[PDB]
């Protein structure tokens, strides 16, 4: 079991240090790969739309989830990005400037959408919610 | 338990309560010093000395008769073991094992036993060298081991 000796402080600190790595979240934060991810440790990331594509939905559902392949201007990555709402995709257009936010679940794909981690919240610097709710149109 | 096998037995000697010698032991402590020195000068180690007193001359315990242990009598008269008893016996054992093993190169269980005996020699020698009963650089040389014993 445990080493409870009084002079084994070194042994127990070293043990916890080596074993803190078999925890996934710690390894993910202290291994550095968030800085090889597309945002590279960013909250949002602005980019340009290359084409509105549309991707199928996983087996229990059945749909065409309307996504847009965008390119990130901070680091040159290309990704997919959902356009969340009914009909709201049309406001997006090819080579419009869009802010790619997180789509939820903390960097892991969400819902029935295969291989999408990113949502579009702004296009041409105008709130995508604002165009959905006709508050302020681009 | 037993250090180099998983035996866990508890057989041993249990010394009687009365530290004072029993009545019929009227032995004269000078005469038992003579007896110890005669048996030691006869070439013999303290274990056999104690056996002979217990069995032949009816001395229950040397420390009950004299108050002085066998080794400390022998040290006082300068007949002590130049190599301490049990280390002597372990070296004799390992010399015997190795003399057999140089003729039987394919006796692997005795390779294991010799590794155990030399492990035991080295632990006991480390103790004796911290207690200053052996020279501080006395080292069990397997090559020059056969002379020091038997």
């Amino acid at each position: 079991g445990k080493t409870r000796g009084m002079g084994a402080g070194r042994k127990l600190k070293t043990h916890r240090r080596n074993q803190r790595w078999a925890d996934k979240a710690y390894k993910k934060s202290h291994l550095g790969n968030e800085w090889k991810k597309p945002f590279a440790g960013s909250s949002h990331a602005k980019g340009i739309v290359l084409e509105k594509i549309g991707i199928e939905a996983k087996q229990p559902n059945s749909a065409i989830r309307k996504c847009a392949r965008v390119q990130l201007v901070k680091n040159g990555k290309k990704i997919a990005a959902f356009v969340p709402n009914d009909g709201c995709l049309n406001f997006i257009e090819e080579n419009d400037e869009v802010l790619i936010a997180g789509f939820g679940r903390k960097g892991h794909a969400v819902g029935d959408i295969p291989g999408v981690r990113f949502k579009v919240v702004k296009v041409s610097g105008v709130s995508l919610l604002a165009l959905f709710k006709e508050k302020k149109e681009k | 338990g037993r250090m180099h096998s998983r035996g866990k037995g508890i057989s041993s000697s249990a010394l009687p309560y009365k530290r004072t010698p029993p009545s019929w032991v009227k032995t004269a402590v000078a005469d038992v010093d003579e007896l110890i020195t005669k048996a030691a000068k006869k070439g013999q180690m303290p274990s056999q000395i104690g056996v002979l007193l217990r069995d032949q001359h009816g001395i229950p315990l040397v420390k009950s008769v004299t108050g002085s242990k066998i080794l400390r009598i022998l040290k006082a008269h300068g007949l002590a073991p130049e190599i301490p008893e049990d280390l002597y016996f372990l070296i004799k054992k390992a010399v015997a094992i190795r003399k057999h093993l140089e003729r039987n190169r394919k006796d692997k269980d005795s390779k294991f036993r010799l590794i155990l005996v030399e492990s035991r020699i080295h632990r006991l020698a480390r103790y004796y060298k911290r207690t200053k009963k052996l020279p501080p650089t006395w080292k069990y040389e397997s090559a020059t081991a056969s002379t020091l014993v038997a």
């Binding site: 409870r4 000796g5 009084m6 | 309560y17 530290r19």
Partner: protein
């Protein structure tokens, strides 16, 4: 090996949780006798007879079945007279009874005595 004051405390716990009347403890110590004295003085066991023939020693305690638990915190910590008070909550059933037995330079003695005399020590164990 041995770390007695455990060979003994878990022996009394086993014996009392079963309901035995007299338990015998194969090793003894100044710590053993001074510990059992704290239990008896606080009124948790009755008398006990220390067989000291000529060897390590032996004890036989005569239980009242009024003790509920006793434990040794081997890994004997250190203990100032301010964190008396966050062990007394940490180990004990409540703020009312139960005692932590801390060796102190005024001999082995429990935690309320330790606070009154304003000394710290090293926790040996506890009982409640």
């Amino acid at each position: 090996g041995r770390r007695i004051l455990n060979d003994a405390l878990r022996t009394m716990v086993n014996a009392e949780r079963r309901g035995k009347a007299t338990a015998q403890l194969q090793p003894i110590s100044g710590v053993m006798i001074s510990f059992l004295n704290i239990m008896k003085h606080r009124g948790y066991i009755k008398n006990f007879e220390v067989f000291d023939p000529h060897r390590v020693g032996k004890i036989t305690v005569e239980l009242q079945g009024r003790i509920k638990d006793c434990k040794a915190l081997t890994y004997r910590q250190d203990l100032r007279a301010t964190e008396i008070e966050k062990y007394r909550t940490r180990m004990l059933p409540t703020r009312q009874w139960g005692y932590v037995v801390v060796t102190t330079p005024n001999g082995v003695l429990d935690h309320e005595e330790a606070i009154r005399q304003n000394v710290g020590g090293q926790v040996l164990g506890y009982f409640h």
